[PDB]
Design an enzyme around this catalytic site. Sequence first.
Site, PDB file in Angstrom:
ATOM      1  N   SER A  58      -1.783  -5.733  12.046  1.00  0.00           N
ATOM      2  CA  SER A  58      -1.546  -6.771  10.987  1.00  0.00           C
ATOM      3  C   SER A  58      -0.377  -7.704  11.372  1.00  0.00           C
ATOM      4  O   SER A  58      -0.015  -8.599  10.596  1.00  0.00           O
ATOM      5  CB  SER A  58      -1.239  -6.045   9.668  1.00  0.00           C
ATOM      6  OG  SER A  58      -0.299  -4.994   9.896  1.00  0.00           O
ATOM      7  N   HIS A  93      -0.909  -5.618   5.568  1.00  0.00           N
ATOM      8  CA  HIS A  93       0.464  -5.142   5.362  1.00  0.00           C
ATOM      9  C   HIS A  93       1.438  -5.768   6.384  1.00  0.00           C
ATOM     10  O   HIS A  93       1.922  -5.077   7.297  1.00  0.00           O
ATOM     11  CB  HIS A  93       0.508  -3.623   5.491  1.00  0.00           C
ATOM     12  CG  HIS A  93      -0.159  -2.961   4.345  1.00  0.00           C
ATOM     13  ND1 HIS A  93      -0.853  -1.774   4.460  1.00  0.00           N
ATOM     14  CD2 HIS A  93      -0.201  -3.322   3.040  1.00  0.00           C
ATOM     15  CE1 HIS A  93      -1.329  -1.444   3.261  1.00  0.00           C
ATOM     16  NE2 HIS A  93      -0.938  -2.357   2.370  1.00  0.00           N
ATOM     17  N   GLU A 121      -6.127   1.950   1.094  1.00  0.00           N
ATOM     18  CA  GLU A 121      -7.504   2.158   1.631  1.00  0.00           C
ATOM     19  C   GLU A 121      -8.040   3.489   1.063  1.00  0.00           C
ATOM     20  O   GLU A 121      -9.217   3.617   0.722  1.00  0.00           O
ATOM     21  CB  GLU A 121      -7.471   2.257   3.164  1.00  0.00           C
ATOM     22  CG  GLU A 121      -8.918   2.480   3.738  1.00  0.00           C
ATOM     23  CD  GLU A 121      -8.898   2.700   5.223  1.00  0.00           C
ATOM     24  OE1 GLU A 121      -9.783   3.463   5.671  1.00  0.00           O
ATOM     25  OE2 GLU A 121      -8.041   2.098   5.931  1.00  0.00           O
ATOM     26  N   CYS A 135     -12.283  -5.113   5.238  1.00  0.00           N
ATOM     27  CA  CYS A 135     -12.852  -5.147   6.593  1.00  0.00           C
ATOM     28  C   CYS A 135     -14.212  -4.441   6.640  1.00  0.00           C
ATOM     29  O   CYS A 135     -14.351  -3.378   6.054  1.00  0.00           O
ATOM     30  CB  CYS A 135     -11.886  -4.334   7.478  1.00  0.00           C
ATOM     31  SG  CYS A 135     -12.498  -4.248   9.247  1.00  0.00           S
ATOM     32  N   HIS A 160      -7.943  -3.835   2.942  1.00  0.00           N
ATOM     33  CA  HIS A 160      -7.943  -2.373   2.788  1.00  0.00           C
ATOM     34  C   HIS A 160      -9.051  -1.873   1.892  1.00  0.00           C
ATOM     35  O   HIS A 160      -9.375  -0.719   1.925  1.00  0.00           O
ATOM     36  CB  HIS A 160      -6.600  -1.896   2.260  1.00  0.00           C
ATOM     37  CG  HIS A 160      -5.472  -2.607   2.903  1.00  0.00           C
ATOM     38  ND1 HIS A 160      -4.909  -3.733   2.341  1.00  0.00           N
ATOM     39  CD2 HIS A 160      -4.913  -2.455   4.123  1.00  0.00           C
ATOM     40  CE1 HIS A 160      -3.986  -4.225   3.177  1.00  0.00           C
ATOM     41  NE2 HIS A 160      -3.963  -3.445   4.254  1.00  0.00           N
ATOM     42  N   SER A 180       0.309   1.406   7.806  1.00  0.00           N
ATOM     43  CA  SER A 180      -0.012   2.741   8.318  1.00  0.00           C
ATOM     44  C   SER A 180      -0.171   2.635   9.854  1.00  0.00           C
ATOM     45  O   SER A 180       0.392   3.451  10.589  1.00  0.00           O
ATOM     46  CB  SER A 180      -1.280   3.234   7.643  1.00  0.00           C
ATOM     47  OG  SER A 180      -1.692   4.428   8.403  1.00  0.00           O
ATOM     48  N   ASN A 181      -1.076   1.732  10.311  1.00  0.00           N
ATOM     49  CA  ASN A 181      -1.430   1.783  11.753  1.00  0.00           C
ATOM     50  C   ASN A 181      -0.121   1.521  12.571  1.00  0.00           C
ATOM     51  O   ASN A 181       0.058   2.055  13.702  1.00  0.00           O
ATOM     52  CB  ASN A 181      -2.559   0.762  12.042  1.00  0.00           C
ATOM     53  CG  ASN A 181      -2.078  -0.668  12.176  1.00  0.00           C
ATOM     54  OD1 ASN A 181      -1.666  -1.113  13.286  1.00  0.00           O
ATOM     55  ND2 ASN A 181      -2.152  -1.392  11.069  1.00  0.00           N
ATOM     56  N   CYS A 194     -10.794   3.303  13.357  1.00  0.00           N
ATOM     57  CA  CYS A 194     -11.472   2.146  13.964  1.00  0.00           C
ATOM     58  C   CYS A 194     -11.079   1.903  15.415  1.00  0.00           C
ATOM     59  O   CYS A 194     -10.086   2.471  15.920  1.00  0.00           O
ATOM     60  CB  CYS A 194     -11.265   0.865  13.151  1.00  0.00           C
ATOM     61  SG  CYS A 194      -9.502   0.293  13.303  1.00  0.00           S
TER      62      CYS A 194
END
Length: 309
Positions: free
Chosen positions: A269, A41, A126, A96, A74, A226-227, A197
């Site tokens: 990302s 993303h 995801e 991943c 994802h 998201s992250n 993660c």
Amino acid sequence: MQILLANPRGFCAGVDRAISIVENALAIYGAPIYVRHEVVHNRYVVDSLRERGAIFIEQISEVPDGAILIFSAHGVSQAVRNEAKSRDLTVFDATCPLVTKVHMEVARASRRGEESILIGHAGHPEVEGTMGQYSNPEGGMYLVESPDDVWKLTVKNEEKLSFMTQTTLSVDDTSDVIDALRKRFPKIVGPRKDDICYATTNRQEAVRALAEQAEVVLVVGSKNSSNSNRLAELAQRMGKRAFLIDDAKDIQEEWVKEVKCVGVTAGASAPDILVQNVVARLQQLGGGEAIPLEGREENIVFEVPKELR
Ligand SMILES: C#CCOP(=O)(O)OP(=O)(O)O
Ligand code: SF4
């Protein structure tokens, strides 16, 4: 104005691998290479790849017979995987490994007909992929986002229940969900902590340290990452102004006027060139040499599949 850089920041191992998979496919087979969903993303990575001939699609019905198709970092549901399989497509899977690990657990619970609960954000690719590993009608697969979702969930058999999480959540908010799950369902089984993660846990720890020093935090990342949004949210909850930006052009002068210390970080990302451009623009706005904070070492690399070296 002092500029501080969070550490770690930027690319994780799964993103570096996923982007290499697409670049290497482009190099070996030429344009076009189809990619199901944005490979990661990040607008600058995806627009780039598009300029080089990747075509990003949401549904397999958009892809021509005979084509090469890559699944994004994802991950994808078994339905999507089976739809590609039943089609004439050559597939490479950039999911991943740390997403695939969650998928294998959800498939195990499915085979056993035991219910599973995923903690994650509805609509995120995801979560579609992970929920899409569960297919046993005798069990069940449920999504919760918050403790209130937990307080309203009823399941068929709470004696045989397990949970999983999305990889890119808030570490603190997911802890609250799990505490609610264990109160409501005291026999629930999960991992020791969650499925968040290492890169997500480490960038949130790094942003907490950054925000303790900086008045304003800029997070390099796209709006659908998201992250990335978790890192901005974490700093805002510490009472700092924090902005999620794609690139240096997004920086508004008023955000840093009269600020003595600005922190910059980047989601998993976001490429490092975008951070270097952001630092250059903060230096136009009165910032000094960028000072890297000390941080947790990361050492994990995930290699591309041998067929794509
Ligand atoms: C996959 C992965 C890591 O980064 P992004 O592509 O930003 O993904 P999410 O953070 O899950 O939205
Ligand atoms: S954020 Fe984590 S789980 Fe997602 S691609 Fe990166 S390393 Fe893998």
